[model samples]
Target: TKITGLRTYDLRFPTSEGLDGSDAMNPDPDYSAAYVILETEGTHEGHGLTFTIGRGNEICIAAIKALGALVVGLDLDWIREDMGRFWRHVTGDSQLRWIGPDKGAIHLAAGAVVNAVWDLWAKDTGKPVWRLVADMSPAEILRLIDFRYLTDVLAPEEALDLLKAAEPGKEERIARLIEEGYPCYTTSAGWLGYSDEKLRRLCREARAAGFTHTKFKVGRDLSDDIRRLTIAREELGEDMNIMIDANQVWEVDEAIDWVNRLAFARPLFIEEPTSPDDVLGHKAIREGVAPIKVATGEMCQNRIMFKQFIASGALDIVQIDSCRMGGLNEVLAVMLVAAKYDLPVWPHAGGVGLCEYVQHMSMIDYVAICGEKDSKRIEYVDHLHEHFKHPCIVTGGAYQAPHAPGFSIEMKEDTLDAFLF
Candidate 1:
């Protein structure tokens, strides 16, 4: 099959109207997607998207158009044979390479395109993306990852070795995933704009709904944070794992100080304590916070930075964003490095379609890669899931493994036309 055309969308939901995605830095975010659909010549089609807050989403749409030019006429056979090279070919475009070298708006757009390719492949093979990856041999999985700057921390042989080590129990783990589903924590109950009463109500409901872990947005005001966290504690009781996200609002030393101030709440982890790019800063903060783990990386641009963070013992949890760091290939690179370092990956999901996308990646990490799910928890937020045809199914605070034939990202046609920008 050959590529036919590429369609892109600037789909926005007025989430801020109900304070759905409010956080410390972004007080009013209109959760949006720089969405893409790849239509092949045959009956196959692939859907992919990059999550973005309001305002700048159109720029991402432009970036997708710029990169879509490269995908329009390519042969599907060539891409299926060597996905890693295809990923590099488009991302490392000589002209576009100068724009990102892999980061920011351009890289995010590239991610949408790359994800569509993977989705098409998965759909054609009649499997979910996670199942496809899990069923692949170690060598095939290794070939799908780009190890350009990652050899220092994770060489090809080393990654192959890790995958091989986990190979023996792959079927058993897959059964476990299907039986129990993956553990998850809810963030929908904790937007910063929620009042004390709302916070308590949501926390109680989340607990009642079988959620054992919940997170709240912090770092806005210390007094407010203390009060809200205290309310959450009262409602959920002391046993639940309460986490906090600052959304990169503080400086290095300030992040340490702020986390210590909220130590009484006993957060499971303080996410985005400082800048996503601060490796040494995170190491220092992690040391300062002690038992309260320092976690970041929703906005972590590339694998090179992830390598630095993992190699230096910087972060406690790896929050992989499906769109923020290239696509599945680059995400695989980061996950392998995190597995090498033995760090738990709590992926950042809650934007427009992130939960739908990252759910597959996290499952692949468990069944095929990490082989551990004790400390790992997928972040879930109750937001605009109705727009998609196959939204993620979270029961009793665990994500049920998707049986859909693709990446679970295709938006309904009516929703697509309505949100068209």
Candidate 2:
């Protein structure tokens, strides 16, 4: 076995105080991460982790430890060349993927291990991950992505075509990324459980802080959502683009009705109004919601789901999460699909390590693939930075981007010590 030891921790913060990450389903959720430190006698150590709210934190930690054998004997050299293979081997485990098929606990473990491997690869390359990605040729970059699940919708050849088309503009695009960082949205102001006073103050605060778009959680009580939308309209005024998230809380018929009623408040978009697993349902909701755009995929399972979402016209915005869908390799393919369709990509952030991990993908897409960051906003929830060796730095709600060696994954030693089992 290559591993020296395996360690895990349960880290929790009582966030219900400010209701920072509060939502309709998780009314009193505590923000947390199932943290892991994978040790070896080799010079380079490995770090991996999974995000969680209060309830399932333990299960995630257990899942990380559960992958001990696969990681322990992994060849260090093979890790960089075949991380896609690493991903498939783990997720392809017939027994494990069955429970989630890359949606929940076992899937989070895959995200953690796969991410740590990339961190190791970036450190070895002596370049930041975004630059590392932005620097690669189209062919080499294609090798990094596993297209097994995505082949039905996005074959390797089709993805290669999108990359080749964007190739000439790469240099100009990278220059723009450094000049203007990616666009962003603030969720700081719009918690589902916040009082009208707090919500009003936060929206005003967010605007003054320089965010053009903002979001709030909806769907528990229609009256409360309507009241808050009215309050937000009164405070933020007509100029700001307000978005609402039902957080996967509604049934098909119910989502259509709720979103239609709130459309009077003029949400720029409505997100995850129903089950994320319901792509066709989302399409129906998209038709019913008419003028207002429908968006989902914060909880969509994988690239296969994304292909379905794109093919079905189920979303006006693609909200990909960095840690959720097999990291940049998989996400890059999703961005290519968006480019082909001319859809906007507003990345879904706000969970632990998300702001740090997601900024890299968005910045790379802006500079190399998309050639612009316009009409796109990365989600921002300001919390839990104190734990990371390198956390995101956001000033005026815009991320400064990571200049660190790896993927900004190392945790502060003291924080790990405090939570270690």
Clashes of each: 0, 1
Candidate 2 C-alpha lDDT tens digits along 1-421: 1456667778776776777788887787777777666676666566656667777788877777776667766766665566567667666768766778777787776677666666766766666678888888878777777788677677889888877877898887777666666778888787887889899998888878878888989999999999999989888878888999989898889889988999889998889888888989999999999888998877776788888899878888888877666656677878877877777778887677777788888887776676677768888877777788878777665767567777887788887767543
Q: What overall lDDT, based on C-alpha atoms, would model 2 receive against the true structure?
A: 0.78
- Candidate 2, run of 10 with poorest lDDT: 1-10
Model 2: pairs clashing at backbone N, Cα or C within 3 Å: 389-410
Q: Kindly list the per-residue Cα lDDT of model 1 for residues 224-330, writing each as its tens digit.
A: 99889888899998779899999999998899899899999999889998888899999999999999998889999999998899899999889899988789999
lDDT of 1 at 335: 91
**lDDT, candidates in the order shown:** 0.90, 0.78
lDDT at position 330, candidate 2: 71
Point to the candidate with the largest TM-score.
1
Error of 1 at 323 (Å): 0.8
